[PDB]
Amino acid sequence: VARKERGWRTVFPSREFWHRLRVIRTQHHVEALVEHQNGKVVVSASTREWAIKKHLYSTRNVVACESIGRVLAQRCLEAGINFMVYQPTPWEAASDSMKRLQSAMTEGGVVLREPQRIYE
Amino acid sequence: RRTPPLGPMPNSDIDLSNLERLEKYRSFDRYRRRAEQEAQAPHWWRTYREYFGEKTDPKEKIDIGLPPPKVSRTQQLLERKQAIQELRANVEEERAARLRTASVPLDAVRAEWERTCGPYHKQRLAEYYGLYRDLFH
Amino acid sequence: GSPWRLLGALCLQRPPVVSKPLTPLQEEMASLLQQIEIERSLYSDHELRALDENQRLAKKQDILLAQDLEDMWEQKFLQFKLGARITEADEKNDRTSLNRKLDRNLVLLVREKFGDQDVWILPQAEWQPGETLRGTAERTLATLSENNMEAKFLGNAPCGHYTFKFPQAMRTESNLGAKVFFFKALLLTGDFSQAGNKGHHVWVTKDELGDYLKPKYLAQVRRFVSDL
Amino acid sequence: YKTKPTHGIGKYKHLIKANLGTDYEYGVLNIHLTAYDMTLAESYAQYVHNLCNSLSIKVEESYAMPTKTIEVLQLQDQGSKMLLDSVLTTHERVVQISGLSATFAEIFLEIIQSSLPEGVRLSVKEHTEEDFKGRFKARPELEELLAKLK
Amino acid sequence: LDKARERPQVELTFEETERRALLLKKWSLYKQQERKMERDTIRAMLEAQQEALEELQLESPKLHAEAIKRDPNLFPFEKEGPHYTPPIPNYQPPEGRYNDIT
Amino acid sequence: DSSRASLTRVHRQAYARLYPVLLVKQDGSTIHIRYREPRRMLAMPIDLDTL
RNA sequence: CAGAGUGUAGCUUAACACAAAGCACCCAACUUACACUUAGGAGAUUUCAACUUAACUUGACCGCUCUGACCA
C-alpha cells in the first residue's frame, strides 16, 4: 500500500519502485547494489570483497558476475527482501553476464518484479 | 532584468573556443555516469533531494561501539596477493573461468564475510531499518 | 654575434629492404591465421578439379591432374633461385658495404680529426647566414667525398641537438663552445666510390652505434634514432 | 526564468557546433594505400586510423575506391601469341586527415614509413584541388543551410 | 552461391581449443608490449624534437622562424613496401602485356 | 616496424581458399601474396611497349 | 663528481577501512574503416628500520628532474 514515486516519464530510469538493483561493471571490478528509492542502500555485493576474491579467479568476467549474483541473492534472502526491479539498457540486458546474473537471482529466489500498489 | 547567478554555472568551466578539440562523450554510458556523479553533488538551486531527500543533523553520528581492531595492511595484502597468485596459476581454475562454469563456496564466502565485512553491512542494514533512529534517539 | 658556434649535421639513414626475420610466435600467428582461412574458406577451383578427378577415377579424360600441376609448380619453384638474405657482407661483417644487414636499418658515420684524436660523429657543416640548415645539409652531402647519393628530406625543424665545449684549449670569449643540430633523411639510391672505404665512412645499426659514439653523443642520438 | 538568477541553465546549443591552410600546418591531406592484397591494405589503413586516433589528429573520413582489375598476360614458349596467365586486383584504401603540424608531419611520415608492411605503396599528398565537396546533404544540415541563406 | 564449394567442418579438439585460448591470451600481452614500445619511442622522439626546437629558438629567432615555416617540397612523397628477397640485378623475364576489365 | 600488420586474415563472409604464393617483380624481388591457384612461384613479364 | 628537489602501472588532493580505487590504455567480435557495444588481458605503492596503522610521519638506501663540476 506504500505509494510509489510515479512519474519521470521523460527520463531514464523510472523511479516507480520500492527497491532497485543496480549493476556497476568497472574496468577491474563488478559491483551490485540493492537500494531503496529514497536513496538509502540496503545491501551490497562487490568484487573488491576478500571473501569472494579468495575464490574468484577474475573479477571482470561471467564467472564473477554469476558469483556476485548468487551471493547477493543469498544476502537479500537473509535480509528478508524478495522483490526488486531491474532497469537495464538494451545492450547490457542482451549482455550474457547480466542474463546469467538474472538466472542466479531466479535460482536464489529473488523476484525482479514488484507487486502492484493496492490503491483500493 | 537579469540577476547574476549565486554560484558557478554547471558548464562554466568547459571552454567553447576549441569545442571541436574537446573529446565528446561518444556513448550513452559515459554521459549517464557523469550525470549521476553531478546529481550526487550539492547545488545552490532547488533540487529534488532538497524536497524529497531525508535531512540529517549536521553533527556527526555519535558512535558507542567497540573500538576498531588494528591489523597489518601490508602483511594482509601480501598474503592475499600470494593467494590470488596461486589461484590464477592453478590451470583448472583458469579453465573453469574461461568456460564460465566455475562455482564458489557460498558457505565459505559467507563465513569469511561475517568476519571481514559483516559488521559494516549489518550496521548499514540496521540504519536502513531505522533501529538506530527509534531506539537510542 | 654569440660565443656559441652553429653547425648543422646530417644523419643519413637507409631503411631495411627486406622484412625482419619472423619471431617463432609470429610464425605461429601466421600458421593459425592460415589454418582459420582454410577452415572457413570455400573450395577453390583446384580442389574442385581434384575432387571431380578422384570421384571420376573411383567410378571408372583429363590428361593433367591437380597433383601433377602442384608437383610441376614445386619443380619450377626448386628450379628458381630466390634472393639470398644472407650475403657476403653479412659473412664478413662488412660495415662499409650497403649489402650488410638487409633486415635492419643502417646509419652513416664519418671520421673527423678534432683535438689530435679521431672522433666518430655524423657529417656536419658550419652554418652560414642566408642559408637554411637543410641547405647546409645538402652542402654537407656534396662535401662528402666521392659519393653519388640521393636523399629524401622530411621537414625543416631539427631532430635533435648536441652541445659541447672546448677542453680549455680553444675556449675563448669569442668562441666558448658549439652546438650541432641533427636532421634525418632517407636514402633512395647511391653509393660512395671505391677509393676510400675504411678511412672515410662506416654504416652501422643502432645497437653497435654506441661502440663508435661517445656516451653523451649516443645519449643524444638515441632519442631520435630508432630500431624498428 | 529570465529574471531569476538561474536563467540560461537550460541552454545546450552553445556547447554544440553551429578549409583554410595556415602557414604552419597543412589543411587537408590524403593518404592512399595501393596493394594487391586487400586484407593487408585494409589492415594497414585501419592501423593508420587507430594511430591517428591515438595521436589526436582529426580524420575527415575513411573510404575506398573501386578496384581496378589488371590481368597478367604471358608470351607462350616457342611462339608469338600473348596468352592470359593470371589476374591481379589493385585495391586502394584512402584516409583523409586534416590538421597535421609541419613539425609533427616528419614524425608521422617516419613512423608510417617504418611500419609500412610488404607489398603496399603509400602516397601522402594534398588532394585539395579536386575537392568538389559535392556530397548529398542530410535533411537537418540542408535545412540549417537554407535558414542561413534565406 | 553454390553449396558444392562449401567444405566440411572439421571438429576442434579440447586440447586444440585450450592451446588457441592460451595463444590468444599471450598475443594480447605481446601486442600490448609492442604498442607500449611504439608509444614510448614516439614520445621520446617528440620530446627530443621539442627540445631541439626550443634550443634553436634560444640560439636564433630567425632560424627558428624559417625552420617552423612549412616546406613546399614535401607531400608528393611515395613509399613502397619492402620485399621478401632483395631484387635480382640480373633478370630478364619474358614479354607480356596488361588488360583492364570493368 | 614493417611487421605491425603483415599477419592478417580475410574479413569476408564468403570467399574461396587462397594459397601462399610468390610474385616476382621486374627486378626479381619476391613478395608474398595469395592466389586462387597453387602457383607457388609467379613472375610478371616485361612489357613490349617499355622498350 | 658536488648542492638543492622529487617518488602509487600513464594520470589522479584515490585510499576512513571493510579495500591497493576510477579512467585511459591492449586483444578478439561488428564495421571498408571509425565509433558504440559484447567477450578477454596486463598491470603499480623503490628497498630497509623507528613504541605501531604507517603509499601517508622520521631517517638511511634506491630511482629520477634542476643547478654547479667534467667537457671534441
Domain parsing of chain E, residue ranges: 1-87
Measured in Å, how far apart are chain E's first and last C-alpha atoms?
22
Rg for chain A (alpha carbons), in Å? 15
| Alpha-carbon separation of residue C148 from C96, C100, C135, C193, E88 (angstroms) | 15, 19, 17, 8, 22
C-alpha cell at D55: 595521436
B1-60 residues near strand G (Cβ < 7 Å) = 26-30
Q: DSSP states of chain C as a string?
A: --SEEEEEEEEEEE--SBPPPPPHHHHHHHHHHHHHHHHHSBPPHHHHHHHHHHHHHHH---SS-HHHHHHHHHHHHHHS----SS-HHHHHT-SSSTTS-SSS-EEEEEEEE-SSSEEEE--EEE--TTS-HHHHHHHHHHHSTTEEEEEEE--SS-SEEEEEE--SSS--SS--EEEEEEEEEEEEEEEE-SSSSTTTEEEE-HHHHHHHS-HHHHHHHTTT----
Rounded Cα gap, residues B57 and B39, in angstroms: 21
* Chain E: closest CA distance from residue D51 (Å): 10
Q: Which residues of D touch F2 (CB under 8 A)?
A: 114-118
Cβ of D109 near strand G (distance < 7 A): no
CA atoms within 13 A on the CB side of B72: 6
The values of phi and psi at residue E45, to 5°, are -65, -40
C-alpha cell at A106: 531466479
* Chain E: closest CA distance from residue D23 (Å): 6
Q: What's the CATH code, domain C94-227? A: 3.90.79.10
User: Looking at this protein, which amino acid is placed at residue C186?
Assistant: L
- CA–chain centroid gap for B73, Å, is 21
Where do the structural domains in chain D lie, given as residue ranges?
A: 1-128
The values of phi and psi at residue F32, to 5°, are -80, 125
Domains and CATH numbers, chain F: 1-45 (6.20.130.20)
The partner residues of D117 in beta bridges, in order of sequence, read: none
The partner residues of C180 in beta bridges, in order of sequence, read: C7, C162
Contact D85, D94 (CB under 8 A): no
Rounded Cα gap, residues C10 and C27, in angstroms: 38
Instruction: Name which CATH class applies to E1-87.
Output: special
* Beta-carbon contacts below 8 Å between C and E: 107
Cβ of A62 near strand G (distance < 7 A): yes
Please, is A97 exposed, middle or buried when counting C-beta atoms within 10 Å of its C-beta (0-12, 13-18, 19+)?
Answer: buried
Closest CA to A43 of A65, A77, A75: A75
The partner residues of E95 in beta bridges, in order of sequence, read: F46
Q: How far is the CA of B71 from the C1' of G49 (A)?
A: 20
Rounded Cα gap, residues F38 and C71, in angstroms: 10
| DSSP classification of residue A111 | B
E39 Cβ contact list (under 8 Å, min separation 6): D54
Cis omega (within 30 of 0) on the bond before E86?
Answer: no
Q: How far is the CA of D47 from the C1' of G35 (A)?
A: 15
B117 touches chain A (CB under 8 A): yes
- CA–chain centroid gap for D58, Å, is 10
C-alpha cell at E92: 630478364
* Chain B: closest CA distance from residue D9 (Å): 7
The partner residues of B9 in beta bridges, in order of sequence, read: none
| Alpha-carbon separation of residue C63 from A39, B134, B137, C46, C53 (angstroms) | 84, 100, 103, 15, 11
Chains B and A touch (3+ CB pairs under 8 A): yes
Q: DSSP states of chain F as a string?
A: -GGGSSS-----SS-B--EEEEEE-TTS-EEEEEESS--SEEEPPEESS--
> Measuring from the CA of residue B121 to each C1', which nucleotide is nearest?
G18
Rounded Cα gap, residues A54 and A47, in angstroms: 10
Comparing CB atoms, the residue among C154, C156, C157 nearest residue D110 is C154
For chain B, give the longest Cα–Cα distance.
Answer: 73
Contact E81, D118 (CB under 8 A): yes
Comparing CB atoms, the residue among C34, C36, C73 nearest residue F39 is C73
Name the resolution in angstroms.
3.0
* Interface with chain C: mutation pick from E19, E55, E91, highest number of C CBs within 10 Å: E55
User: Looking at this protein, which amino acid is placed at residue B117?
Assistant: C
Cβ of C199 near strand G (distance < 7 A): no
State the pairing for strand pair A19-25/A85-86: parallel
C-alpha cell at B90: 592453478
Closest CA to F15 of C70, D63, D89: D89
- Report the SS3 class of residue A22: strand
Q: Which residue of B has its CA nearest to D53?
A: B23
SS (H, E, C) chain D: CCCCCCCCCCCCHHHCCCCCCCCCEEEEEEEEEEECCHHHHHHHHHHHHHHHHHHCCEEEEEEEEEEEEEEEEEECCCCCCEEEEEEEEEEEEEEEEEEEEHHHHHHHHHHHHHCCCCCEEEEEECCCCCCCCCCCCCHHHHHHHHHHHC
Tell me which residue has cell 631520435.
Answer: C224
Cβ of A90 near strand G (distance < 7 A): no
Superfamily for domain range A1-119: Ribosomal protein S11/S14 (3.30.420.80)
Q: Hey, CA dihedral for C43, C45, C50, C52, is it positive or negative?
A: positive
A79 touches chain B (CB under 8 A): yes
The values of phi and psi at residue B120, to 5°, are -70, -40
Residues in chain A: 120
User: Looking at this protein, which amino acid is placed at residue E68?
Assistant: I
* Neighboring chains of C (3 or more beta-carbon pairs < 8 A): D, E, F
The partner residues of A86 in beta bridges, in order of sequence, read: A21
SS (H, E, C) E25-42: HHHHHHHHHHHHHHHHHH
Angle at CA F24, nearest 5°, toward F21 and F27?
A: 165
| Residue C105: Cβ within 10 Å count | 16
Rounded Cα gap, residues D139 and F35, in angstroms: 45
> Measuring from the CA of residue E24 to each C1', which nucleotide is nearest?
G27
* Neighboring chains of E (3 or more beta-carbon pairs < 8 A): C, D, F
Closest CA to C181 of C112, C131, C124: C124
Where do the structural domains in chain A lie, given as residue ranges?
A: 1-119
Contact A3, A18 (CB under 8 A): no
Q: What is the edge-to-edge ordering of all strands in the sheet holding A41-46?
A: A41-46, A30-36, A19-25, A85-86
| Residue D78: Cβ within 10 Å count | 5
Judged by CB atoms closer than 8 Å, whether chains meet at F33 and D116 is answered as no
The partner residues of C110 in beta bridges, in order of sequence, read: C121, C201
Closest CA to C163 of C206, C117, C220: C220
* Chain F: closest CA distance from residue D29 (Å): 23
| DSSP classification of residue B64 | -
C54 Cβ contact list (under 8 Å, min separation 6): none
Measured in Å, how far apart are chain D's first and last C-alpha atoms?
31
| DSSP classification of residue B135 | T
* Beta-carbon contacts below 8 Å between C and F: 65
Residues in chain E: 102
Chains E and A touch (3+ CB pairs under 8 A): no
Closest CA to E79 of F6, D29, D114: D114
The partner residues of F43 in beta bridges, in order of sequence, read: F24
> Measuring from the CA of residue B68 to each C1', which nucleotide is nearest?
G17
Contact E84, D119 (CB under 8 A): no
D36 Cβ contact list (under 8 Å, min separation 6): D88, D89, D90, D91, D119, F23, F33
Q: How far is the CA of E38 from the C1' of G25 (A)?
A: 13
Closest CA to B116 of B63, B71, B67, B65: B71
Q: Which residues of E touch C77 (CB under 8 A)?
A: none
E73 touches chain D (CB under 8 A): no
C201 Cβ contact list (under 8 Å, min separation 6): C96, C108, C109, C110, C111, C144, C192
Comparing CB atoms, the residue among B5, B11, B16 nearest residue D6 is B5
Tell me which residue has cell 549489518.
Answer: B122
Closest CA to C12 of C162, C194, C188: C188
Measured in Å, how far apart are chain C's first and last C-alpha atoms?
41
Q: Which residue of D has its CA nearest to C154?
A: D106
Q: How far is the CA of B83 from the C1' of G39 (A)?
A: 26
Cβ of C180 near strand G (distance < 7 A): yes
C69 Cβ contact list (under 8 Å, min separation 6): C46, F38
